[PDB]
Design a protein around this ligand. Sequence first.
Ligand SMILES: C[C@@H]1O[C@@H](O[C@@H]2[C@@H](O)[C@@H](O)O[C@H](CO)[C@H]2O[C@@H]2O[C@H](CO)[C@H](O)[C@H](O)[C@H]2O)[C@@H](O)[C@H](O)[C@@H]1O
Ligand SMILES: C[C@@H]1O[C@@H](O[C@@H]2[C@@H](O)[C@@H](O)O[C@H](CO)[C@H]2O[C@@H]2O[C@H](CO)[C@H](O)[C@H](O)[C@H]2O)[C@@H](O)[C@H](O)[C@@H]1O
Ligand SMILES: [Mg+2]
Ligand SMILES: [Mg+2]
Lengths: 305, 306
Amino acid sequence: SKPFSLPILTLSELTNSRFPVPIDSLFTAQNNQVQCQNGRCTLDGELQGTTQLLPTGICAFRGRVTAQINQRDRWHMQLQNLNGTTYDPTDDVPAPLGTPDFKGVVFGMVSQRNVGNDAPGSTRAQQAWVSTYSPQFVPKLGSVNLRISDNDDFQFQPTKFTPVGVNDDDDGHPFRQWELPNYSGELTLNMNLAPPVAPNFPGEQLLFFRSFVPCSGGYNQGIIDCLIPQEWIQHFYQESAPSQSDVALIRYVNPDTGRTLFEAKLHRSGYITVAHSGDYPLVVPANGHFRFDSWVNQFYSLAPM
Amino acid sequence: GSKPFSLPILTLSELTNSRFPVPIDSLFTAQNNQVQCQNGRCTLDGELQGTTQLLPTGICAFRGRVTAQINQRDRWHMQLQNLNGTTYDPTDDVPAPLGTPDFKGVVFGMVSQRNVGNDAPGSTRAQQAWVSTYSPQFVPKLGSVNLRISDNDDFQFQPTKFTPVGVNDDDDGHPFRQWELPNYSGELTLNMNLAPPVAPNFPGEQLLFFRSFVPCSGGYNQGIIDCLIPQEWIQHFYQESAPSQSDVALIRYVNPDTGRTLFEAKLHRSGYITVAHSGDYPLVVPANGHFRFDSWVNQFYSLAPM
Ligand SMILES: C[C@@H]1O[C@@H](O[C@@H]2[C@@H](O)[C@@H](O)O[C@H](CO)[C@H]2O[C@@H]2O[C@H](CO)[C@H](O)[C@H](O)[C@H]2O)[C@@H](O)[C@H](O)[C@@H]1O
Ligand SMILES: C[C@@H]1O[C@@H](O[C@@H]2[C@@H](O)[C@@H](O)O[C@H](CO)[C@H]2O[C@@H]2O[C@H](CO)[C@H](O)[C@H](O)[C@H]2O)[C@@H](O)[C@H](O)[C@@H]1O
Ligand SMILES: [Mg+2]
Ligand SMILES: [Mg+2]
């Protein structure tokens, strides 16, 4: 059977699977619900949730603007899949792949390029925001509404949203990275979700790949934590190596010295635990990276951090 | 005992342009006319060249600190760091910090800041910005570029990131020219440490590009950015580092649904593709199609006409 492996990449050579920026650091969290939908992939290469392969697709939208309403979330964007194919709301997914998986405001830019009868080929771009609290944030149903900076220079044309960062809303709705949006809006229940993840062995905590993403005002730290980085997902999708057990023991190595700094459990469904108690930002050498060691079971006892 | 060379298995819509952070839209072969892009450059055995780095989010991005303001259109002086935040060394054997744009034009996107040190550390701001690679202050090799921004009154001398969104022509006779390299050290200085120019070296052959139509911020520009190999291939070759057994790999474009080979192409050691065709031609091929490595050939191999 095909041997399992990780790509060999340092933290600064990794992309966050939940927001399109590099990983900054590793962090282990005290146990308190973690159920992100981007950055979800099994070790044998099955994408889950809203996970797709392109880093530039994460928290992006593609579609057409078709209407406007007299509300702050003004511009109605009918979604396509990121690859431009028609979105099917009956698909067994929580929302179009790449849809943001947190409550907050995503800021970035919208761009348009006209087709058809009105000035075909004409383009425009400007700052925009997508609130995932909005009652018009209904990506599962096939649309989201945009806030934009200049309502007078925007048309009913093919549109792309390119994310840049996140924030709390200015009306006080907070950025909550672990709270899922309502993908079909008010009074609906999310479906086809990747399951929640949590440690299942005493003394263990989740380990995250952490980024501090851009914010657009105020003091928010911009923390987005992912379970496994995008390049690992891309690798597992390519390799599709059979999982020999429920846990891949992995070692964080300093390649300059050859030493193992600590060990961790990489679970079959695509998340990591370590043996530690308390919130702890790791501060480890810049050339460090994980390597696969061996297959173990759920009850393997890790060396403490 | 050579490690077998391979490509990742990815359809066009599962590929990222290595010269701008967007997906590939189509394949295009061009009539012969100089092609010397610096992003998206990697040898088949995994050696990154030019200004190529590994992350799609790094392509046409900048990171550093704004340190000065000048009274000109390109107003805000951004002292660059490497994209990973480490100190940039202008004496390194690269053309410019990795990720620097490799074309003449304007890149538009957003700048964001997050303060450090004593002055309101943790405070943030973000707004639209433009970087003109025609600017005499576009001197990334020397360690800085100047930014145009939307709101000059809300911008500080603090850590800054530029996130690209699209490209455009610049104003009054400075067009977006994807095959014209900027002067990385500014006027009157020669670019150095460049990835080499690429061209077909066999009669009847043309380059094949992975083409994207990127966003533009006004006007009618098509936003065409062509790359030699997509970012995921670069990432793959960097991981694999398979020895190249000749200067030319034969690759076939296959429809996995039918198992049929649609056409063949040469994938050259320095990381670019040629096909046997005459004339500008946008390919129209099945959505599930993808290249697979067939075998190592050589310069004398005559491709079947595309
Ligand atoms: C911390 C600041 O955040 C951003 O500015 C704030 C706006 O985003 C908005 O929320 O309103 C508040 C209050 O006016 C803004 O903060 C003030 O910003 C000014 C500068 O315009 C001063 O810095 C004040 O001290 C803030 O209270 C952002 O644009 C700004 O640059 C700051 O990072
Ligand atoms: C094609 C248009 O491109 C953008 O607007 C143009 C500006 O970017 C700039 O180049 O000046 C020209 C001419 O004034 C602008 O075109 C006019 O834009 C207005 C709307 O603001 C009308 O569309 C006119 O018909 C254009 O000539 C862009 O913002 C705009 O939406 C168009 O795509
Ligand atoms: Mg490994
Ligand atoms: Mg292959």
